[PDB]
Design a protein around this motif. Structure first.
Motif, mmCIF file in Angstrom:
data_model
loop_
_atom_site.group_PDB
_atom_site.id
_atom_site.type_symbol
_atom_site.label_atom_id
_atom_site.label_comp_id
_atom_site.label_asym_id
_atom_site.label_seq_id
_atom_site.Cartn_x
_atom_site.Cartn_y
_atom_site.Cartn_z
ATOM 1 N N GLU A 76 0.828 -1.199 0.000
ATOM 2 C CA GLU A 76 0.000 0.000 0.000
ATOM 3 C C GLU A 76 0.867 1.255 0.000
ATOM 4 O O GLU A 76 2.050 1.206 0.341
ATOM 5 N N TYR A 77 0.268 2.380 -0.380
ATOM 6 C CA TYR A 77 0.986 3.650 -0.418
ATOM 7 C C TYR A 77 0.991 4.304 0.962
ATOM 8 O O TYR A 77 1.807 5.181 1.242
ATOM 9 N N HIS A 78 0.069 3.871 1.815
ATOM 10 C CA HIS A 78 -0.035 4.421 3.163
ATOM 11 C C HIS A 78 1.284 4.277 3.917
ATOM 12 O O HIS A 78 1.572 5.050 4.830
ATOM 13 N N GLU A 79 2.081 3.284 3.534
ATOM 14 C CA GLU A 79 3.365 3.053 4.190
ATOM 15 C C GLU A 79 4.112 4.372 4.390
ATOM 16 O O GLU A 79 4.383 5.094 3.431
ATOM 17 N N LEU A 80 4.435 4.678 5.645
ATOM 18 C CA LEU A 80 5.149 5.913 5.964
ATOM 19 C C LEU A 80 5.335 6.034 7.480
ATOM 20 O O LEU A 80 6.410 6.392 7.957
ATOM 21 N N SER A 81 4.275 5.735 8.228
ATOM 22 C CA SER A 81 4.331 5.816 9.683
ATOM 23 C C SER A 81 5.206 4.705 10.255
ATOM 24 O O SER A 81 4.884 4.113 11.288
ATOM 25 N N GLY A 82 6.314 4.423 9.579
ATOM 26 C CA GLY A 82 7.219 3.384 10.032
ATOM 27 C C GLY A 82 6.481 2.065 10.191
ATOM 28 O O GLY A 82 5.252 2.017 10.154
#
Lengths: 121, 121, 121
Positions: free
Chosen positions: C85-91
């Motif tokens: 997913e693109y949501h990946e970011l909040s570690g």
């Protein structure tokens, strides 16, 4: 030399460091949490546990989402910082048995117990 | 030529090879076990299965640990010897449906059945 | 200019495109399905949900197979087309808490509720 009667509490009190530990739960131990609990949750469960298992439904349901969040974590973990446990050594094959061992005594038993209730209940 | 009346049993008897199969459970089939059972466990379950599901709790609980042991196995598996099944071919997309197919008939049904009981029970 | 009174229905009718959407379920959305449902299944569950949880057994059982099919999908996914997913970011660390957040309010509560029933039931 400051005998430190309580001046530290004042400094720490204004630092509200305690809050840091609260956020650390999901902002650090978020992973160790799912594990640490299983320890605290087992201590009591052992003492006594005979609910309607309803709790599982909530878990089972949300668990569906987890496979999308957690699995999306592990899958990316190996690609991210990759830092598995140090215990790794007993091969990956035994890794499965390592768990079946603890429950082996339980399942083999409870498994036949509950299955038996299938006859009547 | 040794008609082999039973001399083999004596040699094998002293070899207690049977023990090798016992350990193989967790010292080899530890992975295939979780699967082989699901076959044997289903044969009977089909015949009759209506317990309190309590068994699940024990699983659900320990299952939390598994995600730390098993997942730590799969994650490392791909990095270890990587030897997925040969069935791989129907893409990874269908892989999800491949399961939903068997249960599709079950869930779509039981899912509405149990959900309905929500109205009264 | 064809005001299109219904000629499209005739063409589309002979195309039975609707069938394409039926197969897409397991032949495309097979992955999004497990998720999309969890949304539709929750809307009603929220309204009311108090079954025997029996549904879980069927899931828990077949779920054992999933770890062999799904996990064999994710494990290979990262190796296949890898398209998280693109949501990946909040570690990846918070990824675990991100779920514990929604339930944090639920578990912390229901967890103590059901556990309490352990005292008597």
């Amino acid at each position: 030399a400051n005998n430190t009667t309580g001046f530290t509490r004042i400094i720490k009190a204004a630092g509200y460091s305690w809050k840091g530990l609260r956020a650390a739960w999901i902002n650090e131990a978020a992973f160790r949490q799912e594990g640490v609990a299983v320890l605290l949750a087992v201590v009591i469960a052992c003492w006594l546990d005979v609910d309607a298992i309803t709790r599982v439904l909530l878990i089972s349901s949300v668990m569906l989402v987890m496979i999308v969040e957690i699995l999306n974590s592990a899958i990316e973990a190996v690609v991210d910082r990759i830092g598995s446990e140090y215990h790794e050594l007993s091969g990956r094959a035994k890794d499965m048995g390592s768990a079946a061992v603890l429950i082996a005594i339980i399942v083999a038993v409870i498994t036949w117990c509950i299955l038996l209730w299938s006859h009547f209940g």
